[PDB]
């Protein structure tokens, strides 16, 4: 029915990436993030910003020749947090209600058959 592209949302903490590409991936179409739509460092991840970046992305998305899109949501991953950032579901919620018909969305956070020593040491990191 529509013209399909790929949404692909990387939502870590301290920032959230939204950017749509051609269904193959090789050629992209507009990006914009949460760090872009506010200036305060501390407020780089928050849903409020992602919503704004969802808004910008939706504009250019339909500005070229895309009408619909499948999303591939994703946390940091690797030897890092493994859990979805705040402004990723909020970045998808603001992208869902924008006309761009969605379809089939899986998680793609890189998960290892574990290893490479995590950072932090025996004491560990964030507190």
């Amino acid at each position: 029915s529509q013209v399909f592209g790929v949404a692909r949302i990387y939502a870590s903490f301290n920032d959230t990436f939204v950017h749509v590409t051609d269904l193959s991936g090789k050629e992209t179409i507009a990006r914009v993030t949460g760090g872009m739509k506010v200036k305060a460092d501390r407020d780089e991840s928050s849903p409020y910003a992602a919503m704004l970046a969802a808004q910008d992305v939706a504009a250019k998305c339909k500005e070229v020749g895309i009408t619909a899109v499948h999303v591939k949501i994703r946390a940091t991953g690797g030897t890092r947090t493994k859990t979805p950032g705040p402004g990723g579901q909020a970045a998808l919620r603001a992208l869902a209600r924008s006309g761009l018909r969605i379809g089939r969305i899986e998680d793609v956070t890189p998960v290892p058959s574990d290893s490479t020593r995590k950072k932090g040491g025996r004491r560990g990191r964030r507190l």
């Binding site: 506010v38 305060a40 407020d43 928050s46 849903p47 409020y48 910003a49 919503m51 704004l52």
Partner: protein
């Protein structure tokens, strides 16, 4: 001086009211009562 003295299915909340401080920072019923 003699007279006597005397919701919606979808809730509506402002960005500042909820946990969206960043949205409020860039943010920009009397008739119904009448």
């Amino acid at each position: 001086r003699s007279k006597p003295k005397e919701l919606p299915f979808f809730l509506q909340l402002s960005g500042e009211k909820v946990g969206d401080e960043a949205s409020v920072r860039e943010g920009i019923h009397r008739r119904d009562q009448e």
